[PDB]
Amino acid sequence: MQIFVKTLTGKTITLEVEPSDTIENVKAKIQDKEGGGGGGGGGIPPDQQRLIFAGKQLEDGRTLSDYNIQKESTLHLVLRL
């Protein structure tokens, strides 16, 4: 299914996910989508980032289906520094 993410730089991207995908699996899919410019090494680590859905912070050890995140949902990436 498709979900959308608003990234830290304000872009919107589309991911292909399954309801059983874990929160870190989703985060990793986001990183994959943003790595065709800088070139070498350059990024903010997964643990400094969180995903928010409808005002709620998503936690690790959980899947998309655990938050009832369905197709065409938008998630927001935020920093937790």
From Swiss-Prot:
Subcellular location: Cytoplasm; Nucleus
Domain Ubiquitin-like: 1-81
Modified residues ((Microbial infection) ADP-ribosylthreonine): T74
PTM info: Phosphorylated at Ser-73 by PINK1 during mitophagy. Phosphorylated ubiquitin specifically binds and activates parkin (PRKN), triggering mitophagy. Phosphorylation does not affect E1-mediated E2 charging of ubiquitin but affects discharging of E2 enzymes to form polyubiquitin chains. It also affects deubiquitination by deubiquitinase enzymes such as USP30.
Positions bearing the site annotation: Essential for function: H76
PTM-bearing positions, type Phosphoserine: S73
Site (Interacts with activating enzyme) residue list: R62, R80
Reported effect, R80K: No effect on ADP-ribosylation
Glycyl lysine isopeptide (Lys-Gly) (interchain with G-Cter in ubiquitin) crosslink residues: K6, K11, K27, K29, K33, K56, K71
Reported function: Exists either covalently attached to another protein, or free (unanchored). When covalently bound, it is conjugated to target proteins via an isopeptide bond either as a monomer (monoubiquitin), a polymer linked via different Lys residues of the ubiquitin (polyubiquitin chains) or a linear polymer linked via the initiator Met of the ubiquitin (linear polyubiquitin chains).
Name the UniProt record assigns to this protein: Ubiquitin
Origin species: Homo sapiens
Gene: UBA52
